[PDB]
Design a protein around this nucleic acid. Sequence first.
DNA 1: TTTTTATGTACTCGTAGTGTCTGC
DNA 2: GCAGACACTACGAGTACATA
Lengths: 186, 319, 228, 228, 228
Amino acid sequence: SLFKDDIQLNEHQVAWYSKDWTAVQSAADSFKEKAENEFFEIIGAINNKTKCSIAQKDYSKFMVENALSQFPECMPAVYAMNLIGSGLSDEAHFNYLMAAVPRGKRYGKWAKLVEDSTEVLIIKLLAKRYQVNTNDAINYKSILTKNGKLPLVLKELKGLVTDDFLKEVTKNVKEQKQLKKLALEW
Amino acid sequence: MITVNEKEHILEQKYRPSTIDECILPAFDKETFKSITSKGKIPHIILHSPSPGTGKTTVAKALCHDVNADMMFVNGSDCKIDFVRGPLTNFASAASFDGRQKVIVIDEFDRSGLAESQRHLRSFMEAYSSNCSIIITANNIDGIIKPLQSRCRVITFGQPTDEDKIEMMKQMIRRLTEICKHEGIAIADMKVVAALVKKNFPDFRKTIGELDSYSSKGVLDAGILSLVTNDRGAIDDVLESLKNKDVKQLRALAPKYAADYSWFVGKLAEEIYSRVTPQSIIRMYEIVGENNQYHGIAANTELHLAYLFIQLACEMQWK
Amino acid sequence: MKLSKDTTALLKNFATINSGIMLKSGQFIMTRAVNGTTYAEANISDVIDFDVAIYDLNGFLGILSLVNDDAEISQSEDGNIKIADARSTIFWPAADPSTVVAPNKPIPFPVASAVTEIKAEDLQQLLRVSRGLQIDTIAITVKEGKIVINGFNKVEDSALTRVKYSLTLGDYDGENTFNFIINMANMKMQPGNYKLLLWAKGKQGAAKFEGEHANYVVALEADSTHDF
Amino acid sequence: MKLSKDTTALLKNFATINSGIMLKSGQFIMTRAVNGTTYAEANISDVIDFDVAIYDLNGFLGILSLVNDDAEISQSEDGNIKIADARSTIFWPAADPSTVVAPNKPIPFPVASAVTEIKAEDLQQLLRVSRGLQIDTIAITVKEGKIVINGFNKVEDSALTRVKYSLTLGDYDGENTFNFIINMANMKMQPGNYKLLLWAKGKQGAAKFEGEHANYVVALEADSTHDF
Amino acid sequence: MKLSKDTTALLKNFATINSGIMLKSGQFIMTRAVNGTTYAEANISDVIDFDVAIYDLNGFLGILSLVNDDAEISQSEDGNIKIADARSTIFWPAADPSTVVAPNKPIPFPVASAVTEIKAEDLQQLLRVSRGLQIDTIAITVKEGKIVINGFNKVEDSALTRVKYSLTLGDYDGENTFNFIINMANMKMQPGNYKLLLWAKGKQGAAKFEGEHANYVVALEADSTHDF
DNA sequence: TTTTTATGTACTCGTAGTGTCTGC
DNA sequence: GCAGACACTACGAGTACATA
Ligand SMILES: [Mg+2]
């Protein structure tokens, strides 16, 4: 901190002029700021009957179909492009929707279910040890409470929680609250 | 008035404008560029189309030319992180010894795999902002990370006003005329020049590239006008037979286009959309969409095309 | 203005406190860490006969290894650096002053709050020692009369109490027990024998090692407690 | 219990053959694949002091390069494990045996139909030719009295016809004819001198690789052909 | 037929020009790059006794380090390449000529527009510097009655505006004036002293290096300029 | 004002780890 | 002769597109 007169060189200027790239990097990483899309001005036009004309902007037959999939007033039209639309021009799939789904409004919230993260890990586990697909696995868990005492079996299987396997269950440090959680109360 | 490069035969690159005035642009846009060249210093800028050949990468070099910058021109896809650390850091830190604005032109920077380089650039732009500025050229903005658009004046092309379009077109016609004098191309009918411009409007590159291919015979006459306004493949015989609701004719055209179906079906959607009433549109997609969908299960493809025609004939209410 | 095995050597080192450097005219040269933490001055045989700033020193010097020792360096026509060799010539870029951090002035060291010294292998011993066992910080302080250094690993020894190497320097005539700390990557000086002046006036202090070639000054670390 | 520098290396190696392992008390380890293709046994000089099952091996040997080498790996106070360190302590999961495929069959290689040796430097040459000459199967057999190896290319040369490689391994004296084919994929030993004992009666069979640091036994591919 | 270290060091070179090669009986070998930019011809120690096309040169040369330095080679009954060792033996796929872009014969070099020569000592310094100086292309013109050479940075440079380097070759006897630019990338020659043969018939134009071992031709750059 | 299906296939980037070879 | 430093490879991250 010598010299004692430096108009502070900004976090960047120091990164670069000194040329250690690892500090330059974290300065890079600074703005990663990941978000994008504007697909809701496309949904909006199909709804409000304004004009966009597409072509210019990226379009998602999956994203437009799903968004509308919300309001039952639309399902007839989406249902249509769903059976039939596989194989239509994005230009088309769009032009159609303009001329079918009639009113306009929608407010935001999609419906996503509530996952008990624990319950999913448990079924994903059972289907692993037992080489069954997910529906029997759910049967097993229903059964395995009501006798044969789920702690007996979760204790045997706590063996494979391999943290490759957790990445399959949730996506965050919620995922590390779980490593511990069945390592525990059985 | 017109800059010619003379090291190129390819002719849409022979006539590439040297300065900001030679460029044909929307009024407000030209004016904002004059404003910039006036102040003598050039900010960080993004030029984007997404329609090709509106003049983005041309105006990039012109802006530099007008302010007399020391300019490094760089292919976007060549500008990976080690380039920015390497060659660009050198140039951006070095001092031009005539006191010229230093400017780095990164052309066609909208590639996806360069996001890592672009982030690395966001810190750079603030460090070296005193020396030199960056002009990015892009076809699709979303390929430019948000913090780079924050740091720039984003100027957006080829989306003129209704008036600009009318002026720009006059300006482009005047220009084409002038290119013809120079090139030895005889203009018999001015109507064909106004037609080439209108045909390919946003894209001024293709509009000149066209002129080369219709000049085979050194003259533009009423006969060339037929080929410029005319449609070389088309759909017309089907569209017409559909309106007339006749069948023997539809029955006969089937085998013609069964040849390549996926393309034909596409044109038919595109072309009927314009020619039929609003709730006929919604019906036509259900009819064409369903037909397209089962094609490739359907065993006789020529018949499957006939089936499509009979279907549309009856249900299409034509505006 | 040719350059000798002697003067290039010391310069490859300044290249490690700071990548670029600014040299003025004299037999005088000096650099600093962009961030402050470090510094270094020196006088040398050969004579700098023009003002110029460099961006890529480590690079610049590599380029010199490739021409004739008797290669005369000049300020080139435009104002960059012409390196005229035997039957060839190289032109390396003069860089923009405002993109190279050099010392404002040759910071003048106060009087010693403390004085002692160090030995070449001792400095060799230490430098060598740390990284191996993972040490990355140290501390000079009075211990049983004399002065000694205690090397820590501040990554796995946060609050600094499990020494992992130690070296004695020479006893302490004055009277009070102080405690000085330095980061380890901050120790750029070249081995050999250095007289070690120490200093303090606030939560701020310094430490100017004196070698028989050049001088190095290193800041302290925030949690050092002098006894003044 | 404590695990050495040589033991752990037969542990990264037994991971290339099974995700999981079960070693038990003794000075013996062994594992074989969930597809019963590949068997590997090894006698170590660190004496394993209890019966444990790990769902994952190559995961465990990871939390073990970090800890220093005291590593009193004991058993946790709740059925899991305890890696004791010079200065820390770590806890790995421990799987119910129902979740690991363990050999359970220290069956003894019957008797050798024929025996022969291979020099380690000459495993070298083959483990490497095959890489860039593109081999994926080989066949051990008799050419001109000695026992040879042929490398082929099951994909390009669909029926082992054009030999991309041959290697000569010291004569056969017994009077038999044979052609033992092995899918290179299912071959996983670290180099070294290896005794080669190959057995087969009629159609069932296998090859056993005796080495001074481990033992290896794999299965002839579909078509191998002999008269024993 | 056998091949020695010296021979191969060549072909490992000729690889960097064309990854394939066709070669026939004699002490002559040659390759020209697929794209029509460079070409090398070679007289060599070892002796070729049959025609053969190699698809993957850069790795055949590789296979060859995988046996002793002496193994004999020939055309197999198998009309492929047999590298036979003391103990082992390899069988390298000889490719169909159709696919190995080779030169039918040897085209003479236009009695040279201009002549001069370059010390191998000198040329090492060019390559050496070019890494150091990011010199990607060069130009050979006439500065004051002598033949110079200038390295550039076509990247940062664009117009070849500023010279970063300038060897000084011979003197210029005759009275034309020119500027022959050369893509550094296109310069694939094992170092050693060369005679230099330049040529141009207007828009036509090339450059020939005349070694002690082989001769090399590279294409000028698009606006190499001259009055020939 | 809202926000991403599951399987298989292909391609580019950066970086880290890996190996063979040469100047002071 | 060995480090240094170069050239190469393997991998994981993010993007993409056709199917269902
Ligand atoms: Mg462009």
